[PDB]
Design a binder for this molecule. Structure first.
Ligand code: 2FS
Ligand code: 2FS
Ligand code: 2FS
Lengths: 286, 284, 287
C-alpha cells in the first residue's frame, strides 16, 4: 500500500503525482496531472485515485477548478470525470459507502457552505444539504459512517467550530468546538477519534494537535508536531498518522512526520522530493 | 388555535390546518380554492383572510390579487374583493378592523404601494405609498401605528424600517435594524417589535432582534435553533411561535417557541409536512 | 479655507494627480503627483498638511489595495510617507476629530471592513477603536459636534441607506435614522450644523438627489438635486457653500464642478477640472 501526494504549490501551482511506500521508505515518480493544482483534495475509491478541485495558480493568472480527475495505477494514466457544479479551491472530501463528498472551498470571493456527492458508477454529482457555516480550508474525516467538517474560514472569521453530517437523515449538526482556531488544518480519523493537526489561526501557523472523542464530546491536546505548518497533506497508515508538506510563514516544507498514538510522539520519517503546500493526499484501502 | 394557510413544497399548496398550543394537535380543515405560496394571513371579526400570494404549479406561475375569507363555522372559503394589484411576498397588519396590504411583487414589479381594506364595505382603498419598495416585507402593529420592517427592493435586501401614522396618512423612516432581513418573521410582544429569521442575500438567518419604542433601539436576543426565511410567525399568550420556512435547501416542519422570561427557544412540535411561505394567524 | 485639493482618482486606470483649485479667482494649480496611483482614497487636512488615506491601485497589470498614508506639504511640494494602517482599505471614509484622523471601513479584496482605526500625527501611530455595527465600503463620513457619522455604503452584498454614529468619549457606535434613499459612494459633508448626503449609487442608477440631516429634529430632508448624476464623488465645504468634484455617472467620468448655495437652495456649475475622473480624495485648507 502506498501514500499518494498530488499537486500542491511551490512558487506556482504544481502537477506532480508521487507515491511513498512506508515499508521501505522509497519514493515513486508517477504520471503527472493534466492541469496543475493546489488546494485540491485526494481520496481513494475501489482502487482508483481521485483529484478534486483546488486552484491553478500560474503567473498569468488564476483559475479555481471544478474538475474531477481519476488516476488508474494499473495503467498509470489520468482520466477526466464529470465536473462539480461549482469551482472549489481549498476543498475537503470524505468517502462514505463508495461515494465522494466534496465540501465547501471557494470560488473567488464566494465562500461555499454547499456540499455535493459523487457516485462513481453513474458518473454524476448531486447536491446535498449545505453546511451550517461557509468553510474554506476545511478539514474532513469520516467516522462511524458520518462526515465531519472541522475548522476553516468563512470569509470573515477563522474558525474553531465543527459540524457533523448524517447522510441518512440528510442534515448537519454543530458539535463541540476546538480549543484552537484552525484553517488549513489536517483532519483525519484514528482509533475512533478525529485528529486536527496544524493549520492557521489568523496569527501563526500551528504545530499543536488535538483529538475529538465522540463519546466524551471533548477536544484533547496531544503531543505537538516538530514543525509548524498549514495546508498540509495528511493520512493514516496502520494506526499511524502521516503529515506531508505545508506552509510555515516563511518556507515550504518537504518534511514528513509520523505520529504513533501508543507512545504519543512525532518523528521525522522522510522528506519529499521538493517542499510544497496544499497537496492532495490519500492511501490505498484496507 | 393557530392557523397555517397555504405554503410551498415542490409546488404551491392549498392546505389549511390548525395547531392547538395547549395539547398539541393538528386539525385538518378545508383546503383553499386556489393553492397559494408567499401569502399572508390575519383575523378580523373572527374571520380568516388569505391576502395575496402566488400560485406555482409545474406549468405556470400566477401572482394573486385575490382576497379569500374562511368562516370558522361552515369550513368553507368565500371569494372577496381583490386588490388593485397582485402581491406575492406580501405583509399585513390590522389597525382599527381594517386590513393593510403592504408591498409585495407582481412579476418584476416591486411595490411601494399600500392599500387598506374595509370588511364593512368589501372595498380596497389605496393610501400613502412607502418610501422604499419592499417585497418579503414584515409588518407589525403597535400604539396603533403600522411598521414595515426589512424586505427586498429588487436589488438590495433592507435593514431599514418605516412607520405609518394613519392620522396624517404618511410614512417616516425610523432606526434601521442591526441586520439585513427579507422574508423575516415580524410581530409585536409586550410592546416590542420582534424580528426573527430571514435572508440577507447570502445566508438564511437564525438571529433575532427586537425594537423598543421608548428607547428607539434594536437589541439582539437569543437566536433560534434553525436557520429559516419565509417563515410564519405569531404570538400566543406571552410567547412567540415560528412555523416552517426555507433554510436554503429543505423545507422545515420545525415549530419553535420563544419564552421572553427565560430568553430561550424550544421546539414544541412539527407540521404535518414541510413547507415554506405560509400564511399564519391566531384567533383573537 | 484657501485652496480645494483633489488627489488621485480613476480614468481608465488609477491616477496619481494632485491638483488644487482656488475658488476666489478660479485657477487650477498642478501640484506634485502622488508616489503611487490610487482611486477610492480619502483626503483630509490636519495642521496645514494634506493626508491621502487608503484607496486602491488599479493598474492595467494587477490591482493592489493600499494601507498607505502619505502626507503632502504645500510649502515643499513633496509627498512624505507615514505609518501605514493595520489593513488595506479601498473605498475608504475619513473624518478628523480633534487633531486625529479616523479611517472608516472600506475593503481589502473580498474582505469588507466594519473596523475603524485612528491616526495620531504627533506620535505617528494607528490604533484600532470600536468597530461599526455594519460592514461598510464606499461609506461617507462627516464630523459634527465632535461625533463621527458613518452614512450609507455597501456591505458586500447590499447597498445601504442606514447611518450610524460614533461617540469617541464612550467609544461606542449607535444606529441613527436611516436616509430615505440608498446611497453607496455618496458625497458626505457638514454645512451649517447639518449633515448633507449628495449623490451615490443604489445598485441600479447613479444618483443626483441630495438629502440632509437636522441633528435636533432627527430627520432626513431632500433639498435641491444636483444637475448631474454621480457616484464616487469628492466633496468639501468652502465659505458656506458645498463643492462637488467629478465622479462616475454610469458611463463617463465627470469633469464638472457644481456648487450648492444653501440660501438660494440652488446648484450651479462653477468650473471644470483639467480632466474627468472618479473616486478622488478631496479636502480644503482649514479656516
Ligand atoms: O489560494 C490558493 O489556493 C493559493 C494561492 C497562492 C498561494 C498558494 C495557495 C494558497 O493560498 N495556499 C495553499 C492551498 C491552501 C489550502 C488550504 C489552506 C490554505 C492554503 C494556502 C496556504 N498558503 C498561504 C500562503 C500565503 C503565502 C504564500 C503561500 C501560502 C500557502 O501555501
Ligand atoms: O415567492 C416566490 O416567488 C415563490 C417562488 C417559487 C418558490 C416559492 C416562492 C418562494 O420562493 N418563496 C416563498 C415565499 C417567500 C416569502 C417571503 C420571502 C421569500 C419567499 C420565498 C422563499 N423561498 C426562496 C426559495 C428558493 C427556492 C425554493 C424555495 C424557496 C422559498 O420558499
Ligand atoms: O474598485 C475600485 O476602487 C475601482 C475599480 C475600477 C473602477 C474604479 C474604482 C471604482 O470602482 N470606484 C472608484 C472608487 C469608489 C469609491 C466609492 C464608491 C465607488 C467607487 C467606484 C466608482 N466606480 C464604479 C465604476 C464602475 C465601472 C467603471 C468605473 C467605476 C467607478 O469609478
Amino acid at each position: 500500500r502506498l501514500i499518494y501526494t498530488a499537486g500542491g504549490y511551490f512558487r506556482q501551482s504544481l502537477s506532480y503525482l508521487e507515491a511513498y511506500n512506508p515499508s521501505d521508505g522509497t519514493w515513486l515518480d508517477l504520471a503527472d496531472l493534466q492541469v496543475p493544482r493546489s488546494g485540491l483534495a485526494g481520496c481513494v475509491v475501489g482502487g482508483l485515485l481521485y483529484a478534486v478541485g483546488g486552484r491553478n495558480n500560474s503567473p498569468d493568472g488564476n483559475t479555481d477548478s471544478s474538475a474531477l480527475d481519476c488516476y488508474n495505477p494499473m495503467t498509470n494514466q489520468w482520466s477526466p470525470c464529470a465536473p462539480m457544479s461549482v469551482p472549489r479551491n481549498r476543498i475537503g472530501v470524505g468517502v462514505i459507502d463508495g461515494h465522494i463528498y466534496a465540501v465547501g472551498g471557494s470560488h473567488g470571493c464566494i465562500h461555499h457552505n454547499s456540499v455535493e456527492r459523487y457516485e462513481p458508477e453513474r458518473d454524476e454529482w448531486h447536491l446535498v444539504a449545505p453546511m451550517l457555516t461557509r468553510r474554506i480550508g476545511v478539514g474532513v474525516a469520516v467516522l462511524n459512517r458520518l462526515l465531519y467538517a472541522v475548522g476553516g474560514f468563512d470569509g470573515t472569521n477563522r474558525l474553531n467550530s465543527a459540524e457533523c453530517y448524517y447522510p441518512e437523515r440528510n442534515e448537519w449538526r454543530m458539535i463541540t468546538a476546538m480549543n484552537t482556531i484552525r484553517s488549513g488544518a489536517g483532519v483525519c480519523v484514528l482509533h475512533n477519534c478525529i485528529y486536527a493537526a496544524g493549520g492557521y489561526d489568523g496569527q501563526d501557523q500551528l504545530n499543536s494537535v488535538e483529538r475529538y472523542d465522540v463519546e466524551t464530546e471533548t477536544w484533547t491536546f496531544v503531543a505537538p508536531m516538530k514543525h509548524r505548518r498549514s495546508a498540509l497533506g495528511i493520512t493514516v497508515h496502520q494506526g499511524r498518522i502521516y503529515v506531508l508538506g505545508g506552509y510555515d510563514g516563511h518556507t515550504f516544507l518537504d518534511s514528513v512526520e509520523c505520529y504513533d498514538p501508543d507512545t504519543d510522539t512525532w518523528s521525522e520519517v522522510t522528506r519529499m522530493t521538493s517542499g510544497r503546500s496544499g497537496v492532495g493526499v490519500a492511501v490505498t484501502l484496507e
